[PDB]
Amino acid sequence: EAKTTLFCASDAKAYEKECHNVWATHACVPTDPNPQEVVLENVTENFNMWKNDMVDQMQEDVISIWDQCLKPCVKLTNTSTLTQACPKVTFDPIPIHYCAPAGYAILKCNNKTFNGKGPCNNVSTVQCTHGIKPVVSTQLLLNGSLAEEEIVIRSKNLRDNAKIIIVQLNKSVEIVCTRPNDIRQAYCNISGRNWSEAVNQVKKKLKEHFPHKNISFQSSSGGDLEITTHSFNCGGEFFYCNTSGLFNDTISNATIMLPCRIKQIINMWQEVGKAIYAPPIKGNITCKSDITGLLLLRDGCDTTDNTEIFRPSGGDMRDNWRSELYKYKVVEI
């Protein structure tokens, strides 16, 4: 068990002009055509998704990606000011495989209910991870991997209300966010039947850890607009979507409409600062994404109405990468 420099592999096309492909062709090797999965029999090993150097390396990679794809027109730090050309690019997250070099391997937990911390019994070793799309988002985890069995709750400590709670669903819900053609007014559509169906399943899973308690979903307690709305990048444009209608206890059965705004000034997740981008492109901007996870925080203090309240959160994208690298770990031979 040690730390070493990983490398990345992708199906990037040397002729495709989408920026993620152009970056991956420069920093990632081709996808290994013959992946070797090796199942260790009757072996248990400890994992800890919350202290995993792989997440910090993926973070450094996505910063390099964005430093090349989504160059801001102006970058403001309390110790630096940058003004540069900011040409629009094609933007669409592609899956990225992370591989260990010689003398190292990647252990993979095949236990379908592992919560991300502790011993795993169905351990296997691989050379590379599966395909992971580097989707930057808040509140809602998008385009990740699903749970193979049932909904998995992951937290460094569920009893600590300051620790983020990562939820992984076993069946995605579709969200379609479109800006038709106020040039910065957008909206999202999501099936209320499938969302209420998903909220009730997450509530049932949370109740197993907090029995005798009512589980309530409410809106964010506050903060920057990045974490009080579902923020995300769609085709190079930054969407900020109101999720007050999703984290409700009175979810309607009809289609739910989330009002969004496209913004040019964004608070950077890569570092402390603000990044100013050019106005939005013209035309129809549409992203149909799969909600495959949630980022929640639980209200502190003891209840007086026997109700635990969970609110969307996020902001540290390392938690996004943990929602996919929980089952992996780099070990020395």
Next chain:
Amino acid sequence: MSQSPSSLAVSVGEKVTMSCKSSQQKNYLAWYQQKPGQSPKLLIYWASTRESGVPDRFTGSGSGTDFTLTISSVKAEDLAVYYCQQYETLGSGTKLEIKRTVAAPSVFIFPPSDEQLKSGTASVVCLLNNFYPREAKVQWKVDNALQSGNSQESVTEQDSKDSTYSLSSTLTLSKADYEKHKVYACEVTHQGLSSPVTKSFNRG
């Protein structure tokens, strides 16, 4: 949570043992001390592990739901309230009281200032300084008539160093009612005093 005892009383050179019980794989807890009038300070985290600067006499212990803080050889600076904190919940607090030898009160009296008499009211002050124990019976009387219903008193927390108290009584009256009488006395009754000490003035 449930901290016990709610009130403890000992003397210098003893060991105290305050408990902190919990409800329902994480031995995590903090202990705080609050000197009188000061903000709480931290002197034990993660169950054991005394924070830097705490002397070697404090020691934490326990596991599961029952935790304990044990003070070897209680000292003056050790007189204060002690809380236990589990994540966001805290205990009821335990006020640590210190016992010491009986001390006679140093009694003093002060008449109203002329700057105050020029306003309209008059305030006579009687001070008991550095005595043990807390209770004392202060009696205000003009000439030989005792006053009642117009005399408020206060007491500071037990001094850390010498574990003593101090009491300040203030008799409020009107300037007219002040210059009406002429003699003012403050008689105190305390265990450390064989006879009630009466310090007085007579200026009116």
Next chain:
Amino acid sequence: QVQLVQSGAEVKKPGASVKVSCKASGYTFTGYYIHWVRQAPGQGLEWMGWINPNRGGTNYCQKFQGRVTMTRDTSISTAYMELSRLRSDDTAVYYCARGINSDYTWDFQHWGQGTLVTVSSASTKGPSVFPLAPSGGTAALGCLVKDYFPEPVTVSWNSGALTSGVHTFPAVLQSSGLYSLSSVVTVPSSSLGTQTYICNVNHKPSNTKVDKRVEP
């Protein structure tokens, strides 16, 4: 060397609101969570919520949800706690606190000096200091900080020079709805003609600063 300096005392009428500030220094302000805990006079500590100064995320105690708001100002490394729809219950000393580290921030190693928040319909009024002159051996002298509101009044002797033997008594609420305290020092009578003694009284709510001489 980490320092947390909070705002001055506040008097508020019921149904109003108060915002207490807590300025941090000596460390990276955005790297550590910051908590707010209040303490009613004569009671225990009560946790209210925490705020993440990096991104601004907050978690409020469910008891105060709806009328508590936590904010930050990264450019000045200052966190704000605002409580609205005030009540006589909310009369308390409000503290900001910071953990030992970011991973485990519930071990409050650093605290502010506290911000007292008094809730009553009475208004602000400065004190009036009167000397308590003494009359061999060791004598005693002091002053009488009378008729002030709200509670916090700090007193020093000779600009903080005289500290040993000093006893500043707790305030008492008079029948007129005004507080009154006394601050005395034990000094030998062999210095009541050579050494001079001045009361340094400070009432931050009314910005009153007074120096009063005490002589026989």
